[PDB]
Structure formats: C-alpha cells, structure tokens
Amino acid sequence: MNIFEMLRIDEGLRLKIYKDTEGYYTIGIGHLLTKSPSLNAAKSELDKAIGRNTNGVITKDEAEKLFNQDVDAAVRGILRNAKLKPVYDSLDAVRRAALINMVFQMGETGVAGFTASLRMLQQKRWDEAAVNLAKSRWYNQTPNRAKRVITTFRTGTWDAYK
Ligand SMILES: [Cl-]
Ligand SMILES: [Cl-]
C-alpha cells in the first residue's frame, strides 16, 4: 500500500463533476474545483485545470494527472510549512502517509491547526494523539475516513486499509 492507493480508497474516482461531502464541486480523485455554488464556475475551473474544453467530463488519465499534482503539492506544502515539517521529519513511512492524507483533505493550514495532536505525534504518544485527533469537526463529519487515518497513526501499519 502507499499514499496513492490510500487516497484512491478515501476519495474514490469520479470522472464527472460531483459535489463533495461539503457540497463543493470536485472531480477525479478528490480534486476540488471551487467552493462557488455555480456549476459553470466549476466547469470553467475544470477547463483551466485540464487545458481543454471539457464539458465537465474528464478521462481516467486526466484524473490521474490531477491526482499526481495534488499529492506532490501536498508533500511539498508539508515540507515548506514550519509547523508540519518537523512532524513529518520525525515520523516513520506509514505515518508520513497518514499526515499527507490529512493535508490533502483539509489543507495545510487546516492540519497546522491541530497543535496538540502534532505535538503528540512528534512525541510518539500514539494513543494520546489518536484521542485528541478525534475531538474535531473532521472526525465528526467524516468519521469513517477519520477513523482510518487515526488508526494508521496509532498503529503505524496499513491495517485500516486491507
Ligand atoms: Cl490545478
Ligand atoms: Cl467518512
């Protein structure tokens, strides 16, 4: 298992514009297009992201290309974030993937706001971080996915995903 497979399970793959858990227009493997309520606005963002006139539908390859850029962007965002970097540097392979999953979902600023959990992870206090992680809007709105990520930090294995 790896980060790509992990997020492909968490996000699914949809080749037509759809609304995510929050009601925002998205496509592919969790690629957010826009927070605007306008479909045309989404379609326009989509065309600009793909580079062709899509009419709201993309191909598998096109979805995978957005996904690659999004994963790379999340890794690079962690590495540039003064708050996230040290956490990431301190973690093992599997757990690094869990951190990337969170940033991909909520963005770096969002994850950087989990001060206590970040500190707990850095300290390798797995069970404590897991409980703290669960006291969040994140966990309350998307509990099944949250539980999978939380299990991954707690255990350091991919068990939640097999
Ligand atoms: Cl883009
Ligand atoms: Cl969920």
Swiss-Prot record:
GO biological process: cell wall macromolecule catabolic process; defense response to bacterium; peptidoglycan catabolic process; viral release from host cell by cytolysis
Effect of residue 26 to E: Complete loss of activity at neutral pH; covalently bound substrate
UniProt entry tagged with the keyword Hydrolase: yes
Enzyme Commission designation: 3.2.1.17
SUPFAM superfamilies, sorted: Lysozyme-like (SSF53955)
Swiss-Prot/TrEMBL catalytic activity: Hydrolysis of (1->4)-beta-linkages between N-acetylmuramic acid and N-acetyl-D-glucosamine residues in a peptidoglycan and between N-acetyl-D-glucosamine residues in chitodextrins
Catalytic machinery residues: 11, 20
GO CC list: host cell cytoplasm
Main location as per UniProt: host cell
pH and activity: Optimum pH is 7.3.
Gene3D superfamilies linked to this entry: 1.10.530.40
Binding site for substrate: 32, 104, 117, 132
Domain of life: Viruses
Induction record: Expressed late in the viral replication.
Pfam family, one: Phage_lysozyme
Annotated keywords: Antimicrobial, Bacteriolytic enzyme, Cytolysis, Glycosidase, Host cell lysis by virus, Host cytoplasm, Hydrolase, Viral release from host cell
GO molecular function: lysozyme activity
Compartment(s): Host cytoplasm
PANTHER family xrefs: T4-TYPE LYSOZYME 1-RELATED
Family: Belongs to the glycosyl hydrolase 24 family.
Physiological role: Endolysin with lysozyme activity that degrades host peptidoglycans and participates with the holin and spanin proteins in the sequential events which lead to the programmed host cell lysis releasing the mature viral particles. Once the holin has permeabilized the host cell membrane, the endolysin can reach the periplasm and break down the peptidoglycan layer.
Record protein name field: Endolysin
Organism: Enterobacteria phage T4
Designated gene of the protein: E
